[PDB]
Design a protein around this ligand. Structure first.
Ligand SMILES: CCCCCCCCCCCCO[C@@H]1O[C@H](CO)[C@@H](O[C@H]2O[C@H](CO)[C@@H](O)[C@H](O)[C@H]2O)[C@H](O)[C@H]1O
Ligand SMILES: CCCCCCCCCCCCO[C@@H]1O[C@H](CO)[C@@H](O[C@H]2O[C@H](CO)[C@@H](O)[C@H](O)[C@H]2O)[C@H](O)[C@H]1O
Ligand SMILES: CCCCCCCCCCCCO[C@@H]1O[C@H](CO)[C@@H](O[C@H]2O[C@H](CO)[C@@H](O)[C@H](O)[C@H]2O)[C@H](O)[C@H]1O
Ligand SMILES: CCCCCCCCCCCCO[C@@H]1O[C@H](CO)[C@@H](O[C@H]2O[C@H](CO)[C@@H](O)[C@H](O)[C@H]2O)[C@H](O)[C@H]1O
Ligand SMILES: CCCCCCCCCCCCO[C@@H]1O[C@H](CO)[C@@H](O[C@H]2O[C@H](CO)[C@@H](O)[C@H](O)[C@H]2O)[C@H](O)[C@H]1O
Ligand SMILES: CCCCCCCCCCCCO[C@@H]1O[C@H](CO)[C@@H](O[C@H]2O[C@H](CO)[C@@H](O)[C@H](O)[C@H]2O)[C@H](O)[C@H]1O
Lengths: 261, 261, 261, 261, 261, 261, 261
């Protein structure tokens, strides 16, 4: 009938029972509070139940191994296996968390905004919204593309509508017999007659290369980002009309045939 | 005949025996409960037996090293090797768990739904269902494709049927001798006569480029996503018929041959 | 001649000797049991000996460092190096364990079965069996391909024989002079006369595009997965025969030569 | 009515209550200070609230598990799960932190500066600014590109405007009948007559290869980085004019046709 | 002149000296035993000396930090740095250990054997032997290729000689004017006259496609894996001879030239 | 009024206050010393301030948690979160540290030196200097390329100027009618007449292949690395001149036209 | 004036002072020994100084935190940060250590030797030496390539000179009108007349395919690895000479032109 060690053992076992009971009731309270909060807002039944079950099971495991440790059973192996499971689930959630962090960065720094034409890794379209995990944009064709934010933060972000002024690049191919001065002066007159082409920017009309069947002139003109395509179409049509009127010919693929026998 | 230290040693050895016995019976109870639950639902015999064997062996290892620690043998090396094995199995299950997390995200955010035409990384087809690990979709050809959810969350998710209105893009190539005004007016009449082409959207009929053997006109018209292909086919057939009737010719690959000798 | 501390030291050294002796005999018993079990079933001599040697050496190392700890020599460095070795071997076995987990998933969810034509990442063939580490399939050519299960779970799994009905796609190219109505009516008659083409599915016969040297008609017809190739061959042969009989010509690569000098 | 152990237990419980109360008030003070600092500067409401909530919850968790440890409940499992969560969030923030470190390196070593034409992994444009996470540059076309700093530090950094002098490379293709000496002397005269071509650098005019339809001469001349394109255009135009005047012909694609029947 | 604490300090210092002396002599004994074993078998001098030096230095470090811990100096930092070094060397040896594990798997499951023609990731040749780290195979050209076992376990393993029967695929292109029935009957007679072509397998002779300049027939016949190439050559030669005798012509690349001017 | 435990508590609290005060003053001294050292050399203000702030905050956190531990509050959670942050920052700095280690290796082993023409992963140019993080080289075009040292250590390092002697490879294509003996003897005479071509090395003049329109001779000659390009140009020019003088013709792309109708 | 606890505190502080003094002197001795050893052999000044500084700073940090622990300040945070730094530097040195391990494996197993022609991942050349970190080989062109050993162990190692006998593969294309028997007998006579072609190996002369403009014969002959190229050149030249003498023609690209208008 020991009085010191037996009393210590009784204190330990009563403390372990109190620990497990308090852990059970605290897990119940936490689960009830989480269920109340998930009821207070929009949530999915299956995911909410899975999350509450995982939280409750985690708390129950914590209090059970705490009670075992208070009793005197070593729980280092259980802690190691729990750490392994936590590392596995962290590696599993690495992709989702990286997308979330990238979305936070995109919201903060604002590389692009809603209604702003962009090019995120080869796909281009008007941005509609930037969610936490992925942005959604509508292409010029009309289809909706959802791009994860991690793949947006990684790689370049071309922004077409950030700069108010953009440049067109015409590549006109005329025959070798065509007069260089006449071609240059016709193209210069066409560029000057246009009103939506900015005159304070560079207006290049130069002979760019000597091709296989034609000499390729290059025309580079700057215009406001909203008139770029219309200017391109109008200038191309006027180039064709004036070249046809002036006798300048666009050559077909040339070929020299050395006839034998 | 010591009374304090010998009593402590006896308490320790009896506690170790109690720990190992209780561990054995608790492992038996847990295995029986898991077997009962797996019987209560659909399960595979081999996988169920492997899982129960792994769980029982884990519990037995836990209680054995707990008994060794209570006796006095250090078990830190066993715990380290068990942690290494847990890390190895976590890295092994990383892919499956990532697929599971991606499936949960796809169910929650609903980037696509059943019966919705999509394009998940180059493969396009009607989605049939979204499971926990992988979705299955039927392509237009009729074959079934199973895509892991991780590879769906990673990369773009093109959704063709999300937007009710989509755009067609015709590229008509006519000869250089063809009249630009006549071609444009014929294409405009063809577009206007169509009823499934939305008139409140942009209807582009412009000269897009000067090709090697033809001048390429571009026609862009918007229509409801359900009439897109039929509108494309009807407009193409009418374009050919009206161009043949009006004398506009679609040129063959042109070539200028400079005859020598 | 101390009686307390000297007795404690004697107890510690005797306990260490008992620990090392019991570790040796337990390692011998475990090795004998493992050897008996490996004898009871099919096993390879070299791999079995290597595994038994590794297990015995691990147990011997465990009991040796346990004896050192009981004596009083700190073994934290040995435990750290053992953990490093365990992590290295876990990273080494990561690929094999990932293949094993993927094989378990493939057996459970059954994306494909034995005797089912599939396409696992670009290679297509009839599945023969699904082992734990890798499946083996015979291609239509007759060669056997062994694909690791991890590379099967990763990436798409196209299943040709899952859906009973599949679609053919004929691309017929006829000359520009050919009558569109006559071509369409001939193709429609050929499709209707076929009995293995399902009549309740869509039967598309439309002008698909205006090519460089021909107008490309598209024919899409559905049939049971077992008659797909035979239907394709029969329809193609009948298309050629009827086009030759009706005067419709398949054009050779066209070219316009503008003769000069 | 014990006086030693009961007093120790009372001290422990009072200390735990003091620990939790002081943790609560210190968390409140830290949150108030962080809120004051975020008010003192520009910040976003949602991100600021999320960061303050995370910091406060972390401090509350710390003080709660400290109080539990002071009471006597083992918290090793909670610490292991917290470490797993910290590792997961560290892996999530790995990309952003790598971009930040790369930005620091780019600011320090200055591989490129604002207003300096560069080529960062295939995209070339004038650098506008180098932020902490990503630099922004305007291409010659006029579009703005935002490149993450990690992808800039990785891979080559071509700098066009670092070196004051750059080299042009003309590839002139003349007919096989053309006189090599005459072609070389004409090209040499054209190069010598140019004033923006540096005369102290190498001026190569050599026959580079015998092509399929022409003999390709190579002209390499050095000029200041600001006159490179203008020199290229002027030299090309003068080359064409002088070759046309001197009778040297640029051959069309040659072909020998062996006529049969 | 304390008798308890001073005696404890003397015991600790004498124990530390004994620990370091025993560690030195045990390191000497282990090094001598390892040197004797390496002498007993084939070994390289430099690698053997490096391995023995590493083992001896590891044991010396272990016993030195054990002596420091017994003295009373904390060695947790040394243990942490040693763990970091162990993790670094484990990551370094990850590739070699993965190759070793893959070699063990290849030996066990036997995906291929010596003298068996295979295709390991694009390279094909007769397997000579499978070592622990890499297999060596001789290609049909005669060069020896050594493939690491990890890269063999990863990716497909095409085995040409596993299946006794393989299929040939002839693609014959004949002119559009050729009689389909005559071509099919000639090919069928050629296939039937062959003795090494299995008659119980499928023997396909069908019109496969309508090409640009020819109609492509397809012939598929099965034969034993040892007669595949000889059957291919003999059937091809007989096809050419019989088509030349029967008047069937293999067309040259066709072209329609629309002469103008 | 306890005298033992109360005195112990007073000692602990006074020790904690001393620890925090000494930590504060030591942090101040370390920050002052680091600031003095950064003043003594070139440094950037922002980076220096950030580094000093990080060091001071780290020391303050260390001494604060040390004071908490001395008081009696468990700090294992704080240590775990600090370890997670350290691992995150280590993964962030992994790329920079790998570049630094690669730079150290490049400086030590000297795979290339300043002023030595190299080819580091597809980009070739004269090396200017090798810094700690990245080398900079000037290409033959004149642009400066900065390559991170990690990407240099990874992958091949082609060194053009390491070997004093290099080989040219001429591919001459002559008509099928050309005399093989005459072509070989002319090429041999041209090679022999050259003085910068080493005569003790192999001088190959052989018929390499039968091409589609020409028979391709191969000429391989060795020369000093400084005369390689000049020898190539001179030999090519002499080859053309002597072939034109001797009647050997370089054929244009040949084509046999079988005229029909 | 306590006699027990005060004496213990004095012992602890004197022990801490002794620990720090002995750590300082041991660091000095180790640095002096390392400097002496680095003087005794070839070393670089900057790298040697950096390594000695790192070693001395590590030892100083170790002894400082040991003294702090002996005093009573908890150093777990310092140990955690030191472990994080060690992990970061281990990840940094992962590439270099992997190259070192691969070099050790290459030296041991000897996949290739000095003076042995190989192909290490697409680059082929004669191996000069195999260092610890990277091998260096001279290509047939004459340039020196340094390949890291890790990238050599990874991927295939084609060894051209391991097998004494290698096979040539001639692809001769003759006109469709050519006699198959005559072509085969001429090629067989040419192969038989050669003395460096092994007669005990297979000597294939078969019709390989029916090409677009020619029938392609295949000739496969084995020869010693040293005579392979000379045999190829001699056989090719004799093939051309005998085909020209016998009237067999090598056809130019054929084309059937269907003339219209
Ligand atoms: C795969 C990933 C792995 C990540 C790393 C995992 C490391 C896990 C380390 C676990 C350490 C547990 O730490 C230790 O646990 C045991 C319970 O088991 C606690 O308790 C133990 O010792 C105390 C000492 O007073 C005893 O009263 C108690 O009966 C006993 O169980 C210890 O007080 C604690 O220090
Ligand atoms: C490869 C991945 C590695 C991940 C990290 C792994 C770290 C492993 C650390 C294991 C720590 C074990 O922690 C320690 O274990 C021993 C048993 O061995 C326990 O027990 C030990 O010390 C107690 C002290 O009272 C003694 O009564 C007991 O006889 C003895 O065995 C300790 O109370 C516990 O603190
Ligand atoms: C590279 C991967 C690294 C992964 C992480 C590795 C962490 C390794 C941590 C090892 C911790 C060992 O934990 C500790 O070990 C020593 C033996 O060395 C044990 O024993 C030590 O302290 C006890 C205290 O009573 C003494 O009686 C004993 O003489 C002494 O050796 C401790 O009871 C245990 O707590
Ligand atoms: C997934 C990533 C994992 C990374 C690695 C994680 C390792 C986690 C190891 C946790 C170690 C905790 O360390 C241990 O914690 C317990 C509380 O639980 C503390 O406290 C415990 O033992 C002390 C001993 O005096 C008791 O008074 C106290 O009642 C008890 O709770 C110990 O003093 C401390 O040593
Ligand atoms: C970068 C990778 C990092 C991987 C993880 C590394 C974790 C390293 C943890 C080391 C833990 C060491 O564990 C601890 O070590 C010290 C020595 O330093 C031992 O010893 C210490 O405490 C004992 C307590 O009785 C004292 O007698 C002794 O004087 C003192 O040095 C402890 O008994 C042991 O518990
Ligand atoms: C995400 C990456 C994670 C990497 C791994 C991280 C592992 C972290 C393990 C921390 C271990 C801390 O180790 C433990 O800390 C507590 C403080 O908290 C110290 O102190 C604790 O126990 C001592 C025991 O005498 C008490 O006096 C003190 O009041 C108490 O706070 C312990 O003496 C020390 O052993």
């Amino acid at each position: 009938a020991n009085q010191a060690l037996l009393l210590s053992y009784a204190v330990n076992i009563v403390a372990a029972l109190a620990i497990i009971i308090v852990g059970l009731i605290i897990a119940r309270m936490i689960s009830n509070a989480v269920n109340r909060l998930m009821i207070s807002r929009k949530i999915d039944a299956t995911v909410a139940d899975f999350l509450s079950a995982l939280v409750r099971y985690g708390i129950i495991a914590f209090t059970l191994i705490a009670a075992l440790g208070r009793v005197g059973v070593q729980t280092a192996s259980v802690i190691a296996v729990l750490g392994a499971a936590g590392l596995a689930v962290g590696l599993a959630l690495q992709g989702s968390l990286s997308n979330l962090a990238a979305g936070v960065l995109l919201v903060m720094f604002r590389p692009f905004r809603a209604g702003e034409y962009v090019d995120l890794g080869g796909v281009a379209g008007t941005v509609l919204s930037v969610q936490i995990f992925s942005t959604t944009m509508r292409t010029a064709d009309g289809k909706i593309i959802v791009i994860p934010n991690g793949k947006i933060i990684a790689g370049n972000i071309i922004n077409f509508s950030r700069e108010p002024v953009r440049r067109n690049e015409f590549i006109i191919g005329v025959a070798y017999d065509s007069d260089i001065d006449q071609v240059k002066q016709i193209l210069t007159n066409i560029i000057q007659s246009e009103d939506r082409i900015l005159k304070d920017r560079e207006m290049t009309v130069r002979l760019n290369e000597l091709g296989a069947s034609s000499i390729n002139f290059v025309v580079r003109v700057w215009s406001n980002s909203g008139d770029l395509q219309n200017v391109y179409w109008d200038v191309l049509e006027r180039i064709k009309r004036e070249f046809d009127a002036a006798g300048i010919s666009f050559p077909y693929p040339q070929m020299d045939v050395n006839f034998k026998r």
